[PDB]
PDB file of C-alpha atoms in Angstrom:
ATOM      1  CA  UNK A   4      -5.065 -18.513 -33.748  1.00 37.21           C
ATOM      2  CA  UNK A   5      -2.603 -16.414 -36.007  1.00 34.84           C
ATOM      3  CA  UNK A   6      -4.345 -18.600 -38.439  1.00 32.22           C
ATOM      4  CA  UNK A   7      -7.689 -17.744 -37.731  1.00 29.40           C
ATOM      5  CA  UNK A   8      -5.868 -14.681 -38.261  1.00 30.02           C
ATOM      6  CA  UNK A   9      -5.641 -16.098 -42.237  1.00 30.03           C
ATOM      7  CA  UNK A  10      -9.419 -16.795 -42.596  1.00 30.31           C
ATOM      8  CA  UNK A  11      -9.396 -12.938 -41.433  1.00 33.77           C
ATOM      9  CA  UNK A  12      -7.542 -12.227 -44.124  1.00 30.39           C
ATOM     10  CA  UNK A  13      -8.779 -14.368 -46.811  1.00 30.76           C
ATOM     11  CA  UNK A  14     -12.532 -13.156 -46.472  1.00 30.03           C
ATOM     12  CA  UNK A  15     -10.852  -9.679 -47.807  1.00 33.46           C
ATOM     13  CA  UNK A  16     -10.996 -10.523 -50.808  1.00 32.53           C
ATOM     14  CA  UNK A  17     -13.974 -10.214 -52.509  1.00 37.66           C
ATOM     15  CA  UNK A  18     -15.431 -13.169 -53.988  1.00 37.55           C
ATOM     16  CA  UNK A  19     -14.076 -14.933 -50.921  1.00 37.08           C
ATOM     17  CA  UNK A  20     -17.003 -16.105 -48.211  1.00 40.17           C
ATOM     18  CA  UNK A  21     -15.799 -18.039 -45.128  1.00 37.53           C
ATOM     19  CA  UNK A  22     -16.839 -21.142 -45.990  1.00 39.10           C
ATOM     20  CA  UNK A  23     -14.949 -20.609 -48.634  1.00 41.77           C
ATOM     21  CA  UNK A  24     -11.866 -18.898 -47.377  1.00 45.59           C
ATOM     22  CA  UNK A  25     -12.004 -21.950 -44.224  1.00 44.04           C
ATOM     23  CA  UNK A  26     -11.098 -24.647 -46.951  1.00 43.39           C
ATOM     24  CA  UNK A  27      -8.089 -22.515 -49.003  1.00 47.81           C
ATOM     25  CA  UNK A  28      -6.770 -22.686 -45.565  1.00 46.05           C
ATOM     26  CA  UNK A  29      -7.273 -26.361 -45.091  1.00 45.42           C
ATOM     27  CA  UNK A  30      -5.634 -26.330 -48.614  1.00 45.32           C
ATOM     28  CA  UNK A  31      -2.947 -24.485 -46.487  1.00 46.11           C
ATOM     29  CA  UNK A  32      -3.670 -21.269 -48.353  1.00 46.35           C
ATOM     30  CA  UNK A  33      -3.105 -18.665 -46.302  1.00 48.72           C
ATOM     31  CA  UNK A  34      -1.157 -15.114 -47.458  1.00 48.95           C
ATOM     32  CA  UNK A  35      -2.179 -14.224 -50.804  1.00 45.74           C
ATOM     33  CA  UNK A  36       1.058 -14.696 -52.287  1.00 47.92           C
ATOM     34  CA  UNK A  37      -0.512 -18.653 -51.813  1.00 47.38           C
ATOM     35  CA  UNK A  38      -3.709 -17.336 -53.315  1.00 46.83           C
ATOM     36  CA  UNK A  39      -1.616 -15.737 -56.277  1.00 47.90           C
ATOM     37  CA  UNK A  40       0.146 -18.773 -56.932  1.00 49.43           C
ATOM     38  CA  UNK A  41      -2.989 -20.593 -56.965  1.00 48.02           C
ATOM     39  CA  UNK A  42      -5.338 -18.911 -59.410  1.00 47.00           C
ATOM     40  CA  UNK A  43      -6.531 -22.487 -60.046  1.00 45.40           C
ATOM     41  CA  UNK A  44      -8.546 -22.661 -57.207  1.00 43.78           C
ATOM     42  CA  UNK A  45     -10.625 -19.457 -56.947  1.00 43.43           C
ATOM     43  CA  UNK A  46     -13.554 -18.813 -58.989  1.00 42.69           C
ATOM     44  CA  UNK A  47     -13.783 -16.416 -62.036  1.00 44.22           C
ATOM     45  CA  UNK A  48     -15.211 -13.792 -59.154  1.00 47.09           C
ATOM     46  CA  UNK A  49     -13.119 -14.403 -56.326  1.00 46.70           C
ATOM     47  CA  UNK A  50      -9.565 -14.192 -59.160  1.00 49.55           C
ATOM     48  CA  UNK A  51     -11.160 -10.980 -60.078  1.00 50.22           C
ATOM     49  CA  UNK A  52     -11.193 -10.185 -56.507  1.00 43.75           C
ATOM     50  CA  UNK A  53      -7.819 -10.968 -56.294  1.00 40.85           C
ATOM     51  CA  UNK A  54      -6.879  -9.456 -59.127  1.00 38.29           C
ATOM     52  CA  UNK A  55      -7.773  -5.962 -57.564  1.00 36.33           C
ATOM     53  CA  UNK A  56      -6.730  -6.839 -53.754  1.00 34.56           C
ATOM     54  CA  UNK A  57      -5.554  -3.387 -53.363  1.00 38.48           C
ATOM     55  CA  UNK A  58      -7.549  -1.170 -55.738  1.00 42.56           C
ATOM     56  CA  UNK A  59     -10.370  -2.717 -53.631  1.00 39.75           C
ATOM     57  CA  UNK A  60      -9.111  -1.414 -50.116  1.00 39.15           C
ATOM     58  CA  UNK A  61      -9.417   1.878 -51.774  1.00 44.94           C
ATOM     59  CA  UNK A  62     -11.844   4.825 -51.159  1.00 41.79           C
ATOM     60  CA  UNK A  63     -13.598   6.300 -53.844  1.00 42.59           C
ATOM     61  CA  UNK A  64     -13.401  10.711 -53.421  1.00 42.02           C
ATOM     62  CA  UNK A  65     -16.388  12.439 -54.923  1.00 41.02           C
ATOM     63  CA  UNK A  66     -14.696  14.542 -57.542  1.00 42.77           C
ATOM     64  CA  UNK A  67     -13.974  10.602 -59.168  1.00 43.78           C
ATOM     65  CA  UNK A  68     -17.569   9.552 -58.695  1.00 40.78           C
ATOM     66  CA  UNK A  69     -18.568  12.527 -60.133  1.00 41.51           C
ATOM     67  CA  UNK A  70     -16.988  11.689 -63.573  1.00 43.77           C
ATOM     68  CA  UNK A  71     -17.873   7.952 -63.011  1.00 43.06           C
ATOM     69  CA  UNK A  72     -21.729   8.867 -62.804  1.00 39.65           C
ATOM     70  CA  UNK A  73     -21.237  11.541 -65.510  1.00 39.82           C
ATOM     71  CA  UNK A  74     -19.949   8.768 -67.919  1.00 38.00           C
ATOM     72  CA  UNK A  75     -22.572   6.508 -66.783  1.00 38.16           C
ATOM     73  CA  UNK A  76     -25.619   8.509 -67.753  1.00 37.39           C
ATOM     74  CA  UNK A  77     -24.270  10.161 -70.833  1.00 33.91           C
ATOM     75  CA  UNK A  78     -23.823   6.324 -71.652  1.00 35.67           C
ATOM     76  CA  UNK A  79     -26.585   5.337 -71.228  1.00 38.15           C
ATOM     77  CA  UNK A  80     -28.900   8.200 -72.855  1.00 33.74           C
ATOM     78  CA  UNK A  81     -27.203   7.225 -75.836  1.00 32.33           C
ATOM     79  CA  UNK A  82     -28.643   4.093 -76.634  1.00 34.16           C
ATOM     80  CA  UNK A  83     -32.221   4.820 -75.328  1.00 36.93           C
ATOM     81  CA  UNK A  84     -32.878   8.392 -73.751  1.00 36.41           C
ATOM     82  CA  UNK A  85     -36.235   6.325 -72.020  1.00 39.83           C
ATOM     83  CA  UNK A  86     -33.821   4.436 -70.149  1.00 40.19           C
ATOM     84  CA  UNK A  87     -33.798   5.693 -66.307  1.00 39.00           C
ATOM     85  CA  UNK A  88     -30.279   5.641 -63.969  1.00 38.17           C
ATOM     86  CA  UNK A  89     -29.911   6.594 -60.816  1.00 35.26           C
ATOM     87  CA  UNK A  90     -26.185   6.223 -58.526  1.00 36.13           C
ATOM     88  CA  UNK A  91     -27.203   5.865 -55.397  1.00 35.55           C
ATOM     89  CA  UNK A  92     -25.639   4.870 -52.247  1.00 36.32           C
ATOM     90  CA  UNK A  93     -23.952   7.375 -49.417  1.00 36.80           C
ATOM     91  CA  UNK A  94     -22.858   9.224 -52.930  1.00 36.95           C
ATOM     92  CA  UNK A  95     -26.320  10.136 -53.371  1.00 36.89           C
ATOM     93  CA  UNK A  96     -26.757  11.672 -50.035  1.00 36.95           C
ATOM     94  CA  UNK A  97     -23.568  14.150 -50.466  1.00 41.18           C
ATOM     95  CA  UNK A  98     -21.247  11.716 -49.265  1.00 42.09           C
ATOM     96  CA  UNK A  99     -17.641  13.153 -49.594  1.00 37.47           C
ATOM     97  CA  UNK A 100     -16.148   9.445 -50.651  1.00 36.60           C
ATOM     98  CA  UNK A 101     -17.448   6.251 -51.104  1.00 33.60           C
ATOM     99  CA  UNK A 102     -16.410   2.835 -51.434  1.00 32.67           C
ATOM    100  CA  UNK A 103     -17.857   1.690 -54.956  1.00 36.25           C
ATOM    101  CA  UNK A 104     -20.519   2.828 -57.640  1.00 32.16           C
ATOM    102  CA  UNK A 105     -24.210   1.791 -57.340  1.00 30.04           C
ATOM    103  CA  UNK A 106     -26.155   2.358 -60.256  1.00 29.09           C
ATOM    104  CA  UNK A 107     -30.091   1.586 -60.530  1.00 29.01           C
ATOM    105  CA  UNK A 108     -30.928   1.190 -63.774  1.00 26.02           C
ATOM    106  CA  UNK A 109     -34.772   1.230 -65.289  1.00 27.69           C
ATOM    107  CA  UNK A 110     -37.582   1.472 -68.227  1.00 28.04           C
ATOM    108  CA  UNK A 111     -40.545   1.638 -69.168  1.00 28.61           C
ATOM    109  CA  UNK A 112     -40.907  -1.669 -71.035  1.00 28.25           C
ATOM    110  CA  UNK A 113     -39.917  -3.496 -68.380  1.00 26.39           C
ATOM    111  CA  UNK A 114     -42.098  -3.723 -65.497  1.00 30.75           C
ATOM    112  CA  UNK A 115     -42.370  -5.972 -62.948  1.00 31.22           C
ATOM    113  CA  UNK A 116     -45.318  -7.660 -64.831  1.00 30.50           C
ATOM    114  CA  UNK A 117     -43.047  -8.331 -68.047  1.00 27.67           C
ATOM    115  CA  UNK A 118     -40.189  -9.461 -66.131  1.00 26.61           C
ATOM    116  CA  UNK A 119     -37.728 -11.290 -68.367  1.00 23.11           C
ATOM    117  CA  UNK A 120     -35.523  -8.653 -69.964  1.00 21.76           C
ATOM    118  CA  UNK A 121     -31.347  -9.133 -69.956  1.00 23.29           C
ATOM    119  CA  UNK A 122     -30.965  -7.267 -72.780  1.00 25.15           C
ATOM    120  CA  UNK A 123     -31.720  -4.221 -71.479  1.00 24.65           C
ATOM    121  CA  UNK A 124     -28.988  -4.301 -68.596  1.00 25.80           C
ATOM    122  CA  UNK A 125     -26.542  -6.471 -71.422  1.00 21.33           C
ATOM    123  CA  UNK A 126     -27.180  -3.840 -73.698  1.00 21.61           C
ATOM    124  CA  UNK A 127     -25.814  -1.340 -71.546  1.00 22.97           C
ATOM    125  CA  UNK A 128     -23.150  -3.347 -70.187  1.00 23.01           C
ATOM    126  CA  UNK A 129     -21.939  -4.017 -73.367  1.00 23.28           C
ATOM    127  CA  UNK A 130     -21.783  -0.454 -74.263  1.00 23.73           C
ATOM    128  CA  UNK A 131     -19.882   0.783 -70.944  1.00 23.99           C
ATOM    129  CA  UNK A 132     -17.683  -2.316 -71.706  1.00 30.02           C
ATOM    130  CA  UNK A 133     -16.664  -0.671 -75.380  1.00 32.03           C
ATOM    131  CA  UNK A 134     -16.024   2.847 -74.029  1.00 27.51           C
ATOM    132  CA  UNK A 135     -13.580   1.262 -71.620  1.00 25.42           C
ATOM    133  CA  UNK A 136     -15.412   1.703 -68.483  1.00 22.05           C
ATOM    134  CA  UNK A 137     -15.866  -0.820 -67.213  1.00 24.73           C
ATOM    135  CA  UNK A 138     -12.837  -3.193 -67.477  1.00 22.79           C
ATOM    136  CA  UNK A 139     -13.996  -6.575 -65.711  1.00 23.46           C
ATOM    137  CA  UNK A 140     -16.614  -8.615 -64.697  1.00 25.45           C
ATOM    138  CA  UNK A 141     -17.088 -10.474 -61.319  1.00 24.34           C
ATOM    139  CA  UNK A 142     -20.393 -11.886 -62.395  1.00 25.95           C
ATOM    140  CA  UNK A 143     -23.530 -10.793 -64.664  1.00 23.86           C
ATOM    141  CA  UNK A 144     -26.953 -12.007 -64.102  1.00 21.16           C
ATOM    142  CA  UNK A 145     -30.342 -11.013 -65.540  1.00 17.37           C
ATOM    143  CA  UNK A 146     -30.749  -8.316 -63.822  1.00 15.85           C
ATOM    144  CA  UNK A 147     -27.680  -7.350 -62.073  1.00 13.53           C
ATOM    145  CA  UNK A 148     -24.478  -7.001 -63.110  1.00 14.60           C
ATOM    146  CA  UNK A 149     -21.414  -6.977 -60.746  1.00 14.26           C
ATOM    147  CA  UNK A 150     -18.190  -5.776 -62.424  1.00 15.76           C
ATOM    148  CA  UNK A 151     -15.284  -3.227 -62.565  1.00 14.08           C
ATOM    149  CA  UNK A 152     -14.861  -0.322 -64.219  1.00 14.33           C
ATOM    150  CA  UNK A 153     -12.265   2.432 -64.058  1.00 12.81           C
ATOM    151  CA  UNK A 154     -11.503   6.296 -65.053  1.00 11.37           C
ATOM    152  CA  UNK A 155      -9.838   6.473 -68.278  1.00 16.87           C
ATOM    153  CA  UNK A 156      -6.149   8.571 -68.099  1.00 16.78           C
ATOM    154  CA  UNK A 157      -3.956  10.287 -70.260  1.00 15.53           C
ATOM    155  CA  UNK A 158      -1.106   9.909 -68.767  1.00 17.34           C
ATOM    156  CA  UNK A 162      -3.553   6.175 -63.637  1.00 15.39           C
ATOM    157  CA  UNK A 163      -6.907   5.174 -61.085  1.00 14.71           C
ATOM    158  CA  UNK A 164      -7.649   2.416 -59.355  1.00 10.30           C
ATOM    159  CA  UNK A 165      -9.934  -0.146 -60.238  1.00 10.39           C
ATOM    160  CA  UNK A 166     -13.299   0.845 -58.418  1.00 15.37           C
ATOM    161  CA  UNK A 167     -16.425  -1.890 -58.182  1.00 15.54           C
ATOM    162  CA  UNK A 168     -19.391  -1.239 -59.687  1.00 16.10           C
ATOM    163  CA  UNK A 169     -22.826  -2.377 -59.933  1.00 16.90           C
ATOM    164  CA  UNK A 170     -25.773  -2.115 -62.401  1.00 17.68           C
ATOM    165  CA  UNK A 171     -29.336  -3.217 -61.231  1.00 17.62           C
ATOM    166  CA  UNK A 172     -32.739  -3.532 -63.731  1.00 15.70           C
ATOM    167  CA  UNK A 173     -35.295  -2.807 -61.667  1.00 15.49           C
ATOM    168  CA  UNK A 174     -38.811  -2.652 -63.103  1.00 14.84           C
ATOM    169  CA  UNK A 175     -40.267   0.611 -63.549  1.00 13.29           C
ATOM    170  CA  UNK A 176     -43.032  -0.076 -61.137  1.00 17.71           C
ATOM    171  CA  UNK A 177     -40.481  -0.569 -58.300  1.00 17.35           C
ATOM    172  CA  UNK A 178     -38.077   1.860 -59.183  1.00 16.60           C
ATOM    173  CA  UNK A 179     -38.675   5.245 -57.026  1.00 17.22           C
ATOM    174  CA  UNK A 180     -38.938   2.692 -53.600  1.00 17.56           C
ATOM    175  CA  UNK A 181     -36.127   1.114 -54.927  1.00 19.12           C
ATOM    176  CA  UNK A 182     -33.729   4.227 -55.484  1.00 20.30           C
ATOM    177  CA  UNK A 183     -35.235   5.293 -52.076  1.00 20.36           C
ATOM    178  CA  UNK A 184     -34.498   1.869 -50.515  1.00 19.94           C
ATOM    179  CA  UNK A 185     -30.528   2.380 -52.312  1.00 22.45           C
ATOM    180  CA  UNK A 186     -30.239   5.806 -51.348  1.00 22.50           C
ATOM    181  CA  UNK A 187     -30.433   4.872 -47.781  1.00 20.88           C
ATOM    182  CA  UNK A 188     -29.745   6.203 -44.959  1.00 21.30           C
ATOM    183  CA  UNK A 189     -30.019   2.775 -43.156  1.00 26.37           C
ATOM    184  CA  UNK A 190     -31.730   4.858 -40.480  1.00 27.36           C
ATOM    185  CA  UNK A 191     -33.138   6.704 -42.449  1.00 28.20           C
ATOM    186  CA  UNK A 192     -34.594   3.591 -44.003  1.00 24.52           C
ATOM    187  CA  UNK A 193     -35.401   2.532 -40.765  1.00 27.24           C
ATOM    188  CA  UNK A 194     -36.662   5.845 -39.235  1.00 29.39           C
ATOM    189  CA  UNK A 195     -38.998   6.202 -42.635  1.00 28.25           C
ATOM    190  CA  UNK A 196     -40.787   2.562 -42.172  1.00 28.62           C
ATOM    191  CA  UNK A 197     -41.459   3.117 -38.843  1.00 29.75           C
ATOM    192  CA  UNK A 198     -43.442   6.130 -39.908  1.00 30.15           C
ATOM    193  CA  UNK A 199     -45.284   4.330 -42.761  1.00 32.60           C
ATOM    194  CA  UNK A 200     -46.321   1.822 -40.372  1.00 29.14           C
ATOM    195  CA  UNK A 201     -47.594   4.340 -37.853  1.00 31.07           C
ATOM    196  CA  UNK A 202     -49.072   5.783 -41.081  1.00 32.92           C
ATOM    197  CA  UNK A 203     -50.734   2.544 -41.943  1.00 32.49           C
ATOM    198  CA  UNK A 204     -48.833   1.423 -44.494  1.00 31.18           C
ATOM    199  CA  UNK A 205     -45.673  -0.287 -44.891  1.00 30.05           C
ATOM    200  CA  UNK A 206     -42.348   0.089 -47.278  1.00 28.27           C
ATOM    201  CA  UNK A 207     -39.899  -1.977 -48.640  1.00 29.79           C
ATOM    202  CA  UNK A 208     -37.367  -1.664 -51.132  1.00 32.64           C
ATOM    203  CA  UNK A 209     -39.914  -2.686 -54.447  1.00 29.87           C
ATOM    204  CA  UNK A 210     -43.297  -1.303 -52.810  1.00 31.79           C
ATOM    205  CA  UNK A 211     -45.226   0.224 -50.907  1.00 30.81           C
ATOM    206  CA  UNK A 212     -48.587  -0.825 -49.851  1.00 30.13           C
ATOM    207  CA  UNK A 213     -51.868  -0.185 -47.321  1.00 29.70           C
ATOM    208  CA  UNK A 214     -52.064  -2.030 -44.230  1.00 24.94           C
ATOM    209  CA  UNK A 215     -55.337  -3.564 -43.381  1.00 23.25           C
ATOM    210  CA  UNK A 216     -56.750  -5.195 -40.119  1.00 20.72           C
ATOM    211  CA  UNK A 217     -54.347  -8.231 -38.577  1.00 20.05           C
ATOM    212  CA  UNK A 218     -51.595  -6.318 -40.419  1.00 17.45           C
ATOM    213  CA  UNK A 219     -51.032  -9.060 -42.989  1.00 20.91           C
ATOM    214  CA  UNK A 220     -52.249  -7.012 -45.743  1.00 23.16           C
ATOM    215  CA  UNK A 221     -51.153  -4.783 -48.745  1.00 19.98           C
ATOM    216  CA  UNK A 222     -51.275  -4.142 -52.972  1.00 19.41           C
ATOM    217  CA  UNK A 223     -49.007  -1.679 -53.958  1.00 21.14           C
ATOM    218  CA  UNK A 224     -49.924   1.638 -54.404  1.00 20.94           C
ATOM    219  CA  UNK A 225     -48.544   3.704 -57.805  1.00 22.17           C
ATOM    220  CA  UNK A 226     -45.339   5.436 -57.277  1.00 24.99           C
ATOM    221  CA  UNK A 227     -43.868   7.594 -59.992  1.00 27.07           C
ATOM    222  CA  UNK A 228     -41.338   9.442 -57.829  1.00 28.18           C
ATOM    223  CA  UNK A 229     -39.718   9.517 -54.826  1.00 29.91           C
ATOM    224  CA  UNK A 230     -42.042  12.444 -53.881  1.00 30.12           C
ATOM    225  CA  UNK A 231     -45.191  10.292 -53.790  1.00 33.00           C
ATOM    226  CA  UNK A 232     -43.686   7.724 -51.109  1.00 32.24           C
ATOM    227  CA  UNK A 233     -43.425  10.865 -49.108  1.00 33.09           C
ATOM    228  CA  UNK A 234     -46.636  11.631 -49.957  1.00 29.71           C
ATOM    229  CA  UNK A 235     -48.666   8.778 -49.079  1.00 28.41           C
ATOM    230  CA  UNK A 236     -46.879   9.206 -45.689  1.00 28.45           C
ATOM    231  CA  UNK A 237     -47.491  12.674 -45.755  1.00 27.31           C
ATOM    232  CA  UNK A 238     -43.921  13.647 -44.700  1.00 26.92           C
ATOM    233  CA  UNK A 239     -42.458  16.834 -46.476  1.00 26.22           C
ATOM    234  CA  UNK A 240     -40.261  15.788 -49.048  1.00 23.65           C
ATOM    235  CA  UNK A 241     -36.725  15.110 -48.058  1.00 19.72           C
ATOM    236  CA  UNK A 242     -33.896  15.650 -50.264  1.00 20.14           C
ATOM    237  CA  UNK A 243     -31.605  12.993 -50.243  1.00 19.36           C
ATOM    238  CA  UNK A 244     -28.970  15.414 -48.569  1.00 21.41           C
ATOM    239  CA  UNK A 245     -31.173  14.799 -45.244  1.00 20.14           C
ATOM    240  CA  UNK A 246     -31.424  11.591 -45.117  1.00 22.15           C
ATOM    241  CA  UNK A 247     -28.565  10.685 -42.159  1.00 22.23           C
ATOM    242  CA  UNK A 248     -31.607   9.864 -40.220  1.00 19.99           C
TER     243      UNK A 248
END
């Protein structure tokens, strides 16, 4: 129906699920001039969303990711130059736009035997939040924090989505690897492992046994050793369509 048509619609905005959009229509919420009137109904997240409706539809060109990830690590080394951050995504791979910021964020006292540290994403948060980088927040966990940031002027950008992840240092490189994608990459790179005898995810990487149903991750300190428990040359992120 031309209504369906408005659940179409609604699920555009970013905090809004179907579930959820199907009852702001029951509501008789449709348009988003209903949505603007009714603030009261929508989440901190999904107002956020809504909020940025259009910034959001938005493609992100390198030369602007560029500064965003230049801000982003000089940021960060600040405050602890042991801290580890990575932007991954399509971005990483030489993409010529993208659609938001991904950043993977690490260190060494955190590992994924300590596990219990907010801190050390808050603290960084915190500080991107002072510099005026990132503007809003959609939500903030633990360990990952879902927000907004944007370029400063001088004279204006748009409001570009971005998102901080702790991982523990023990998982970062398969992590960063798992982010960085390709997805067939991904793929194309598991399959290997497997016919490799081992097997990937996006935290480990661990020996098969007999039965399959096996594992114990294996020490990875790079990106360079997942290749080379696979033995595959090295391949920079750049080749990584497939």
């Amino acid at each position: 129906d031309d209504t369906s048509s408005s659940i179409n619609f609604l699920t555009r905005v970013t905090g809004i699920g179907p579930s959820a959009a199907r009852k702001l229509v029951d509501e008789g919420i449709k348009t988003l001039e209903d949505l603007r009137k009714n603030e009261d109904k929508l989440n901190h997240h999904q107002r956020i969303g809504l909020k940025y409706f259009e910034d959001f539809e938005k493609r992100i060109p390198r030369e602007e990711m560029l500064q965003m990830q230049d801000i982003v690590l000089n940021e960060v080394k600040k405050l602890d130059p042991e801290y580890i951050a990575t932007v991954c995504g399509s971005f990483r791979r030489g993409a010529e736009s993208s659609g938001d910021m991904d950043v993977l964020l690490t260190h060494p006292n955190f590992t994924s035997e300590s596990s219990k540290q907010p801190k050390l994403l808050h603290r960084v948060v915190e500080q991107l939040q002072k510099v005026r980088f990132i503007t809003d927040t959609l939500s903030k966990g633990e360990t990952k924090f879902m927000g907004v940031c944007q370029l400063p002027s001088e004279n204006e950008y748009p409001h570009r989505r971005i998102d901080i992840r702790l991982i523990p240092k023990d998982q970062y490189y398969c992590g960063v690897l798992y982010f960085t994608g390709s997805d067939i990459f991904n793929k194309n790179m598991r399959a290997h492992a497997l016919e490799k005898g081992f097997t990937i995810n996006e935290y480990t990487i661990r020996p098969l046994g007999v039965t399959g149903v096996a594992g114990e991750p294996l020490p990875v300190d790079s990106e360079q050793d997942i290749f080379d428990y696979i033995q595959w040359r090295y391949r920079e992120p750049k080749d990584r369509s497939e």
